[PDB]
Enzyme design. Structure first.
Site, PDB file in Angstrom:
ATOM      1  N   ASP A 122       0.852  -1.191   0.000  1.00 13.71           N
ATOM      2  CA  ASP A 122       0.000   0.000   0.000  1.00 13.71           C
ATOM      3  C   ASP A 122       0.891   1.245   0.000  1.00 13.71           C
ATOM      4  OD1 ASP A 122      -1.874   1.926   0.241  1.00 13.71           O
ATOM      5  OD2 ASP A 122      -2.578   1.334   2.250  1.00 13.71           O
ATOM      6  N   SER A 180      -0.037  15.582 -12.234  1.00 10.26           N
ATOM      7  CA  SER A 180      -0.226  15.187 -13.615  1.00 10.26           C
ATOM      8  C   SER A 180      -0.433  16.423 -14.473  1.00 10.26           C
ATOM      9  CB  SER A 180      -1.426  14.237 -13.732  1.00 10.26           C
ATOM     10  OG  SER A 180      -1.719  13.962 -15.076  1.00 10.26           O
TER      11      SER A 180
HETATM   12  N1  LIG Z   1      -4.273   3.432   0.379  1.00  7.53           N
HETATM   13  C1  LIG Z   1      -4.120   4.148   1.618  1.00  7.53           C
HETATM   14  C2  LIG Z   1      -5.003   5.408   1.601  1.00  7.53           C
HETATM   15  C3  LIG Z   1      -6.352   5.355   1.940  1.00  7.53           C
HETATM   16  C4  LIG Z   1      -7.118   6.520   1.905  1.00  7.53           C
HETATM   17  C5  LIG Z   1      -6.533   7.713   1.516  1.00  7.53           C
HETATM   18  C6  LIG Z   1      -7.319   9.009   1.475  1.00  7.53           C
HETATM   19  F1  LIG Z   1      -8.642   8.753   1.187  1.00  7.53           F
HETATM   20  F2  LIG Z   1      -7.178   9.623   2.697  1.00  7.53           F
HETATM   21  F3  LIG Z   1      -6.729   9.792   0.526  1.00  7.53           F
HETATM   22  C7  LIG Z   1      -5.198   7.765   1.168  1.00  7.53           C
HETATM   23  C8  LIG Z   1      -4.436   6.614   1.206  1.00  7.53           C
HETATM   24  N1  LIG Z   2      -6.360   1.737   0.875  1.00 13.75           N
HETATM   25  C1  LIG Z   2      -5.986   0.824   1.963  1.00 13.75           C
HETATM   26  C2  LIG Z   2      -7.001  -0.317   2.012  1.00 13.75           C
HETATM   27  C3  LIG Z   2      -6.679  -1.530   1.421  1.00 13.75           C
HETATM   28  C4  LIG Z   2      -7.598  -2.569   1.441  1.00 13.75           C
HETATM   29  C5  LIG Z   2      -8.840  -2.395   2.024  1.00 13.75           C
HETATM   30  C6  LIG Z   2      -9.821  -3.571   2.022  1.00 13.75           C
HETATM   31  F1  LIG Z   2     -10.357  -3.722   0.771  1.00 13.75           F
HETATM   32  F2  LIG Z   2      -9.125  -4.707   2.378  1.00 13.75           F
HETATM   33  F3  LIG Z   2     -10.858  -3.319   2.883  1.00 13.75           F
HETATM   34  C7  LIG Z   2      -9.170  -1.182   2.618  1.00 13.75           C
HETATM   35  C8  LIG Z   2      -8.250  -0.134   2.605  1.00 13.75           C
END
Ligand SMILES: NCc1ccc(C(F)(F)F)cc1
Ligand SMILES: NCc1ccc(C(F)(F)F)cc1
Length: 330
Positions: free
Chosen positions: A35, A199
């Site tokens: 992630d 971008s």
């Molecule tokens: N994948 C991690 C993540 C989840 C949510 C957000 C947000 F919505 F805060 F931008 C950023 C990063």
């Molecule tokens: N962006 C981070 C994240 C990754 C996976 C999930 C899920 F799908 F496993 F619930 C939620 C949030």
């Protein structure tokens, strides 16, 4: 040193990707979601409330001879989709694809939200944003990448996500056989802790390219592409019968339509997302309405270049002292 690991979609829609990670001694292998939008390494474990575990593989620190409880440390995270988890903290040995880090903070979940419990294929997350976002208290902890950086041949990792197919995360080197053309690098802002970049514009299908600055984050942890309402409206206007549905919570389109491609600018280069990547299939089993892979960021507050965009490219995360992001076609 370097590491290389295969990453595999968890389902037929590429909703998420999992990568095997070895934790502890002897190794316990867990399949984690890498992630780049978060900075915590957390796992289902022997400490997770039993009713909140449904098929996940758990980390058992008591069976690892190198695990140490980090006395008094706790963690609590909430994700942008409303997901959350929390618990305590071990340190242990963690290896990815042959690359080993000793004394990595491994955050053990005592509680997880329902969306993690229902996703039996994901055993945890491996955060790859900047360490300023790590949630461990009272002592903030470093990410796997930050801990490995010193020993990597080059302070980079690369994301090569597949469309309905396996892909690769590499640490420490750039595979020059994995892309075509040149890599275009662009500046990163770390001021919010994300891999944030700008971008240079977009095009819909074979339309004219519109030069316009879109600030957003490169996030392997988010499935879809979230862009400003003006952009998203111009894309779906080219799809006959598409509309924004409040009951579904986004744009949907007739499953019989063919979708245009979507191009986004990286400096002077262009990354083309094929229209098929934007189809996320029927909203419910048997429905003839399909869910779109490009949605508005108006409710979220930040634009997110999620997996729909990143899997169209070879992506370099360059964690040099001045960080940059590289994009190449593939
Ligand atoms: N994948 C991690 C993540 C989840 C949510 C957000 C947000 F919505 F805060 F931008 C950023 C990063
Ligand atoms: N962006 C981070 C994240 C990754 C996976 C999930 C899920 F799908 F496993 F619930 C939620 C949030």
């Amino acid at each position: 040193s370097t590491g290389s690991a295969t990453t595999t979609p968890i389902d037929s829609l590429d909703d998420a990707y999992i990568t095997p990670v070895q934790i502890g001694t002897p190794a316990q292998t867990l399949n984690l979601d890498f992630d780049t939008g978060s900075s915590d390494l957390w796992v289902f474990s022997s400490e997770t409330t039993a009713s909140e575990v449904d098929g996940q593989t758990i980390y058992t620190p008591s069976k690892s001879t190198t695990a140490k409880l980090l006395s008094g440390a706790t963690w609590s995270i909430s994700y942008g989709d409303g997901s959350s988890s929390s618990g305590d903290v071990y340190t242990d040995t963690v290896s990815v694809g042959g690359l080993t880090v000793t004394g990595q903070a491994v955050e053990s979940a005592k509680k997880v939200s329902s969306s993690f419990t229902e996703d039996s294929t994901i055993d945890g997350l491996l955060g790859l944003a900047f360490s300023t976002l790590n949630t461990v208290s009272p002592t903030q902890q470093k990410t796997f990448f930050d801990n490995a950086k010193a020993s990597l041949d080059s302070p980079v990792f690369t994301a090569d996500l597949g469309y309905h197919a396996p892909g690769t995360y590499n640490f420490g080197f750039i595979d020059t056989t994995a892309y075509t053309g040149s890599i275009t690098y662009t500046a990163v802002s770390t001021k919010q802790g994300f891999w944030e970049w700008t971008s240079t514009g977009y095009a819909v299908g074979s339309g004219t390219f519109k030069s316009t600055s879109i600030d957003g984050i490169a996030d392997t942890g988010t499935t879809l592409l979230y862009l400003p309402a003006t952009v998203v409206s111009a894309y779906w206007a080219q799809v006959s019968g598409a509309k924004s549905s409040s009951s579904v919570g986004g744009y949907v389109f007739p499953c019989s339509a063919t979708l245009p491609s979507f191009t986004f600018g990286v400096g002077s280069a262009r990354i083309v997302i094929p229209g098929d990547y934007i189809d996320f299939g029927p909203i419910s089993t048997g429905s003839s309405s399909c869910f779109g892979g490009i949605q508005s960021s108006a409710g979220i507050g930040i634009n997110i270049f999620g997996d729909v965009a990143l899997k169209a490219a070879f992506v370099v995360f360059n964690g040099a002292t001045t960080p940059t992001l590289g994009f190449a076609s593939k």
